[PDB]
């Protein structure tokens, strides 16, 4: 293995952290932690998408994360 995550909401207002192994976990706490349903982890940097395991595996600790939510997109500066 686990590492831990940075995750925000699209504002980049609400600011949490999660400890994940899986993107199936981190997506499961993001959830929990943000309290809304359906979570698309995207890099905070760039908006690029993360939804397989392999790319999942590639990222560092404490990486910054974008939690998109339905009807959402991810935010530029």
Same mark, same amino acid.
């Given at each position: 293995?686990?590492?831990?995550?940075?995750?925000?909401?699209?504002?980049?207002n609400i600011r949490k952290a999660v400890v994940?192994?899986?993107?199936? &976990?981190?997506?499961?706490?993001?959830?929990?932690?943000?309290?809304?349903?359906?979570?698309?982890?995207?890099?905070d940097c760039d908006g690029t998408?993360?939804?397989?395991? &392999?790319?999942?595996?590639?990222?560092?600790?404490?990486?910054?994360?974008?939690?998109?939510?339905?009807? &959402?997109?991810?935010?530029?500066?």
């Open positions: 293995n686990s590492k831990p995550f940075k995750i925000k909401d699209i504002t980049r994940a192994t899986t993107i199936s &976990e981190i997506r499961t706490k993001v959830s929990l932690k943000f309290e809304r349903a359906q979570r698309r982890i995207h890099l998408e993360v939804d397989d395991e &392999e790319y999942f595996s590639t990222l560092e600790p404490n990486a910054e994360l974008i939690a998109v939510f339905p009807g &959402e997109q991810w935010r530029d500066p």
